[PDB]
Amino acid sequence: KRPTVRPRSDVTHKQLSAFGEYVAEILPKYVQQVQVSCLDELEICIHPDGVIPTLTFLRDHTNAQFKSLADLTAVDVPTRQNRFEIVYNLLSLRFNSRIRVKTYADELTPIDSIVSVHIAANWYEREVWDMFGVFFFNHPDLRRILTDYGFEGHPFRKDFPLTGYVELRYDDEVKRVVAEPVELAQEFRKFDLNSPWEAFPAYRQPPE
Amino acid sequence: ASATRVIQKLRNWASGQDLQAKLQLRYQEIAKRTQPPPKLPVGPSHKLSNNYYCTRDGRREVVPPSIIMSSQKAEKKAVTPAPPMKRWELSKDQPYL
Amino acid sequence: TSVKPIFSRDLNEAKRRVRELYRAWYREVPNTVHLMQLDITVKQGRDKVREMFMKNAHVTDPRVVDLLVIKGKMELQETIKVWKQRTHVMRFFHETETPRPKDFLSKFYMGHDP
Amino acid sequence: SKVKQDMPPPGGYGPIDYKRNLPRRGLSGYSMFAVGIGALIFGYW
Amino acid sequence: TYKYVNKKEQESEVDMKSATDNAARILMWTELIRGLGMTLSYLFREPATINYPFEKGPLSPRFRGEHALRRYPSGEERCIACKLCEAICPAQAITIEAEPRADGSRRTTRYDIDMTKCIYCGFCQEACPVDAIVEGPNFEFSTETHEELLYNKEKLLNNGDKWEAEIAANIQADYLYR
Amino acid sequence: LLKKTTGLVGLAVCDTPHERLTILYTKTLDILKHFPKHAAYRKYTEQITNEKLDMVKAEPDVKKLEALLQGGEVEEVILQAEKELSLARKMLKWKPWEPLVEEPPANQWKWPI
Amino acid sequence: GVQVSPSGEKITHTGQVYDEKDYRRVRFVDRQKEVNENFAIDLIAQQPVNEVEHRIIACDGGGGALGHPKVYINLDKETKTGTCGYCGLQFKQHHH
Amino acid sequence: TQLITVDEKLDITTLTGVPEEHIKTRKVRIFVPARNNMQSGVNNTKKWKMEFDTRERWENPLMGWASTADPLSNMVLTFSAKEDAIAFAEKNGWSYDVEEKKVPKPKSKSYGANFSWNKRTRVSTK
Amino acid sequence: REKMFEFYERVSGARMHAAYIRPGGVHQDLPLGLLDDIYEFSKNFSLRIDEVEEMLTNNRIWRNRTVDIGVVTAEDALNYGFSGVMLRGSGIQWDLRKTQPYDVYDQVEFDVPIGSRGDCYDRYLCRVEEMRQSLRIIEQCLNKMPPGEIKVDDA
Numbered sequence A: 001k002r003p004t005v006r007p008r009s010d011v012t013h014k015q016l017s018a019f020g021e022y023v024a025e026i027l028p029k030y031v032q033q034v035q036v037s038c039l040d041e042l043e044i045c046i047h048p049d050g051v052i053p054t055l056t057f058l059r060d061h062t063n064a065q066f067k068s069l070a071d072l073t074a075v076d077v078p079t080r081q082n083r084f085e086i087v088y089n090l091l092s093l094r095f096n097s098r099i100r101v102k103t104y105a106d107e108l109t110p111i112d113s114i115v116s117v118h119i120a121a122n123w124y125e126r127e128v129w130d131m132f133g134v135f136f137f138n139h140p141d142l143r144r145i146l147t148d149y150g151f152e153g154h155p156f157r158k159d160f161p162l163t164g165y166v167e168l169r170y171d172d173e174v175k176r177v178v179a180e181p182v183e184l185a186q187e188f189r190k191f192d193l194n195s196p197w198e199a200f201p202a203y204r205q206p207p208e
Numbered sequence B: 001a002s003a004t005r006v007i008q009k010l011r012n013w014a015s016g017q018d019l020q021a022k023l024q025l026r027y028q029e030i031a032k033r034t035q036p037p038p039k040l041p042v043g044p045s046h047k048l049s050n051n052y053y054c055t056r057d058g059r060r061e062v063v064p065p066s067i068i069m070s071s072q073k074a075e076k077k078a079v080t081p082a083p084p085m086k087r088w089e090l091s092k093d094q095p096y097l
Numbered sequence C: 001t002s003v004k005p006i007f008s009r010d011l012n013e014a015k016r017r018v019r020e021l022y023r024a025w026y027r028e029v030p031n032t033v034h035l036m037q038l039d040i041t042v043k044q045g046r047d048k049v050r051e052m053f054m055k056n057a058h059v060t061d062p063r064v065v066d067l068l069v070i071k072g073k074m075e076l077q078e079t080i081k082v083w084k085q086r087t088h089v090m091r092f093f094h095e096t097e098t099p100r101p102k103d104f105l106s107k108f109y110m111g112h113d114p
Numbered sequence D: 001s002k003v004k005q006d007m008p009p010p011g012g013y014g015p016i017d018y019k020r021n022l023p024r025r026g027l028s029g030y031s032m033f034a035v036g037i038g039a040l041i042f043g044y045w
Numbered sequence E: 001t002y003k004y005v006n007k008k009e010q011e012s013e014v015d016m017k018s019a020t021d022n023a024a025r026i027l028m029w030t031e032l033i034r035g036l037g038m039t040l041s042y043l044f045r046e047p048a049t050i051n052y053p054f055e056k057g058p059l060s061p062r063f064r065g066e067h068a069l070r071r072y073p074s075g076e077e078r079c080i081a082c083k084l085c086e087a088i089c090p091a092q093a094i095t096i097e098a099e100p101r102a103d104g105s106r107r108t109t110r111y112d113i114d115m116t117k118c119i120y121c122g123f124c125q126e127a128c129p130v131d132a133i134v135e136g137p138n139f140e141f142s143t144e145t146h147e148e149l150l151y152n153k154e155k156l157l158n159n160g161d162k163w164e165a166e167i168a169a170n171i172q173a174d175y176l177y178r
Numbered sequence F: 001l002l003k004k005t006t007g008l009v010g011l012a013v014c015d016t017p018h019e020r021l022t023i024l025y026t027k028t029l030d031i032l033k034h035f036p037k038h039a040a041y042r043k044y045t046e047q048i049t050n051e052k053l054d055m056v057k058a059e060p061d062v063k064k065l066e067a068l069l070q071g072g073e074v075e076e077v078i079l080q081a082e083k084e085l086s087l088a089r090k091m092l093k094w095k096p097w098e099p100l101v102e103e104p105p106a107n108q109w110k111w112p113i
Numbered sequence G: 001g002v003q004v005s006p007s008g009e010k011i012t013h014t015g016q017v018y019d020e021k022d023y024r025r026v027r028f029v030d031r032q033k034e035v036n037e038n039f040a041i042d043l044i045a046q047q048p049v050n051e052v053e054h055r056i057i058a059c060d061g062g063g064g065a066l067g068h069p070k071v072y073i074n075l076d077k078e079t080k081t082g083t084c085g086y087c088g089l090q091f092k093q094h095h096h
Numbered sequence H: 001t002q003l004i005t006v007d008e009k010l011d012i013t014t015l016t017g018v019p020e021e022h023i024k025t026r027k028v029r030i031f032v033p034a035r036n037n038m039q040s041g042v043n044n045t046k047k048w049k050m051e052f053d054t055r056e057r058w059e060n061p062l063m064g065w066a067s068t069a070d071p072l073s074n075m076v077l078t079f080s081a082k083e084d085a086i087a088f089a090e091k092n093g094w095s096y097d098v099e100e101k102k103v104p105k106p107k108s109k110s111y112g113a114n115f116s117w118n119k120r121t122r123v124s125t126k
Numbered sequence I: 001r002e003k004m005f006e007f008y009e010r011v012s013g014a015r016m017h018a019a020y021i022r023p024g025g026v027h028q029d030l031p032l033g034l035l036d037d038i039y040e041f042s043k044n045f046s047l048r049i050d051e052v053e054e055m056l057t058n059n060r061i062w063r064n065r066t067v068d069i070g071v072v073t074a075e076d077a078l079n080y081g082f083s084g085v086m087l088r089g090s091g092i093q094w095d096l097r098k099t100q101p102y103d104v105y106d107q108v109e110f111d112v113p114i115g116s117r118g119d120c121y122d123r124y125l126c127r128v129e130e131m132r133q134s135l136r137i138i139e140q141c142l143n144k145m146p147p148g149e150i151k152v153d154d155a
């Protein structure tokens, strides 16, 4: 009715809630949380030990048939103990649906790679390792894919600086392309673009 | 468009298509570079009454996601995430090339 | 204070993996210097490898040692099949950078950096 | 006033022949083979 | 719906005339001859080449070219040092320093825009509340040094004074859309 | 008649779709009988396997069977039955009906922080 | 107007000029330091004061949407003309 | 069989890739940021922040821009807890200075105090 | 493409990097005569595609270079995570504009090109038929462009 508000269909929410209950009761050993967002997207948060069984079940089940992996990514939230949140978005062409599977890791506990389940996970887990430093067990070839050759540090982490630590320039004395500690002619001006007034009362956290 | 009839016939025979009907060079059929000034209409919220922002605040209707089950907070027929996709019908316009 | 091991149960086979990686790096240094036409000699390349290992030598957490071994294997393999070039190898030596002496008088004469 | 805005004509735009149109032009295979053989025999004679 | 791009309906059998047609096609190069013919047709069309620099490619009044700082018809600078252009500048290519002028007006002391950092997106000219910064239609300002693309307030004001006869006309032509 | 092609590259045409589906569903039920009785995966997969086996036995026509099963073509249904059998073996090995292995930290899934 | 320093270098409208012993004028050696000749403070000083008949005037800089945001200037002080904060135009109430 | 013991302080400085200068010579500050007194909102005083010590910012000889030489100048990290910031700082090996959350003291606000018979809280204007 | 870059410059002022489509709509309304010029271009554009066909589809050199090259089975494409033209060339009936539609793609009508051999030739044919169906959707958009505001009325 309202031309400025996105229309909402509740049948997708009901279907995804039913499928979330379905997956949660099928796999109680690994599934830690099931939620359906206001956007009608199903998220299932699992233990890191159950990444292989969860992905295999979602790919090979008759009711799931999530044979297409949309993407594989990581989110760095460095306030929790397992700071890397690994997110698997999957697409079911048989049922025209999309699902999200979440798990956690830190800098020193690797999680199982799903190259045996989906083949795009090869390059996607290479990207995740190169950007965040999350190791993957039983990978065919885990190495850097996006950074420079011999790049030291994982740049998509929150504590990594935006400009980095080294910069490249041509030195004529050695006739090479050499790396220097980074110096900027103009420093990146950080902007404090946060209003001191609360925007969304629905997400008001309780006081500590 | 300035081509002679002999060259036009040669081009049409050599390409197999009527080329003078659809020329890729724009000559005069395009719009004028100078246009009359427009008057763009206003949206649905351009009214002087019954237009309180709380009645059309779609940004504030977003809620945190509903927890179906949680490990700390929390005979039936098996279900699917959605009904199975209907098979696509063949094109009635041009099904094959 | 109990965690999941990556590859090594304790420091012993972690040090074994360290020794294997150092062995293979020591093997590859002359081949690297010969193939990528490095201005350096074989001796100081091996010294560079050794003092990189001694730079990392202070850690005794088996998981961190396993991850350092893994990263060293990636660097070594990247040197085996030549994708890391002469510039990337020569980035280890910092021969184009004037070093900062660590004495208080020199750090006082340069600037405000501690 | 009256709003002026970029709009299609009231009668609508004409049809656009988006389909593939190969001319289907060409002499027949039997008769080009016949004229090739005839040229061969005439040249030989 | 959907359609097939390579599938063919049923079978067209194997007839002697069809076999002879295929043999003639791949023995006398019929598709090659027709491709040659229509390439000859394009040899006999008219080229689509304009005569640069004596002929210029057509553009629109919306064109985002070289940056410029405009003025009021009185001659006062339109800029009021409000820093929204550098606040919205996605490449951080605008640096502004300001102080009250001798008559107390709120004006800039420094307005630098880096052409080598600018992405020519028009966010400054659409966030400017007084139509001071504009992306005028100049694009033929390639320089032989990297320094000459590091514009300051004097260069931007000179560009605004140079291109005011065209920038104002473009803004007059297009301002009803924005 | 017989299907000339399946419309998918690399998928063969099965000339005996009913027997293959029957033996695949029977093998799936037999390997599901080794699961624990309280296994939700066993209960659900037995439900779909029994329903699809009943529909296969009910419909002898290939096209009507495909329209009934609505899982694409019957070759795709055969492939899905094979993958379900392999998944049943993998579930039997992994044993996912057990309780939760290890509770996550307190703020592991709290967003925003 | 554009004035020159004792060094011979033109002084900008911001008052910026290089010192005699400043080394940064070598960038202007064999080149030119361009200064915008039209000084906005002088140009707005040349503008006559608009003599209006109202206690509160409204300014948009002229041209409607082509000017600045519309503001209101209170011309109560008879010893001082009211200046627009955007365009710098001066207004004076006619009390005769 | 798959669970070992480690009795250390979780040092990952060898894996972070940061140069040793920007580990040993840096000091970090852990603090709830103070409310901007030009406003009255308190939404920016909810999350703990870690920042780094300010390094040298000099003037560019060409344009006068603020040139810098350290990479950790715009690095600000957000945490939900002081202990989380402590764990992150000790894990990354940075020496930390922590100041506790300055909360506003509860105040006895009474509108009737503005119109008192005998107390000095009676106002002379409104 | 130069003509269509002229269209991009007319809507945004940038030939390539428009930043025109924004969250909430688009940045500005179309200038007058733009729809007429788009129609004048698109009524002649399908002739060009046929000549691209003449220099490629039936050419034996292009057929030798593209036929039975890079044959991808449907299951391999699904497992490798392919999308768009690759799945349709391999024969998978999948298009996001038809399955999970956005904006007014459910209101427009078009056909989806589906290959049968999974090779370079089938992918090329799918891309060309996608060009033709794109021209069909362009015709429908030109005929059914509605009046009204240009961004969401939410300041």
Ligand code: SF4
Pocket: E085, E088, E089, E090, E091, E092, E093, E094, E113, E117, E118, E119, E120, E121, E122, E123, E124, E125, E135
């Ligand atoms: S057009 Fe250039 S200067 Fe203006 S906002 Fe965009 S990037 Fe910045």
Ligand code: SF4
Pocket: E078, E079, E080, E081, E082, E083, E084, E085, E086, E096, E124, E127, E128, E129, E130, E131, E132, E133
């Ligand atoms: S947005 Fe306009 S008035 Fe404001 S500082 Fe920038 S150029 Fe000046």
Ligand SMILES: [Zn+2]
Pocket: G059, G060, G061, G068, G084, G085, G086, G087, G088, G089
């Ligand atoms: Zn004004």
